[PDB]
Amino acid sequence: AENSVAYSNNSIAIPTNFTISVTTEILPVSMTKTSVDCTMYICGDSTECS
């Protein structure tokens, strides 16, 4: 939305009331831990491929 602050060199704007806002912030920390095997993934139950 277009706004225009009414600026002049003798006028100020002071709040007379307030509000208390509780906002939410979501942050990732860790991810899934995985582990791999060579022979079970690549060949798998194969002696000559191992």
Binding site: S35, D37, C38, T39, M40
Partner: protein, 50 residues
């Protein structure tokens, strides 16, 4: 780890145990057998020139 000295901790070890495997071959039921016994148990046989 390819070393003779192992430090403190938890390690993942590759497979070095060897187990023996047999061989199993499965094929469908023997059916629609050759009638060679009809060749063999014939009362009269085929002629020489036919």
């Amino acid at each position: 780890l390819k070393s003779f000295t192992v430090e403190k901790g938890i390690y993942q070890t590759s497979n070095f145990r060897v187990q023996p495997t047999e061989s199993i071959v499965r094929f469908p039921n023997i059916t629609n057998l050759c009638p060679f016994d009809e060749v063999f148990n014939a009362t009269r046989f085929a002629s020489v020139y036919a």
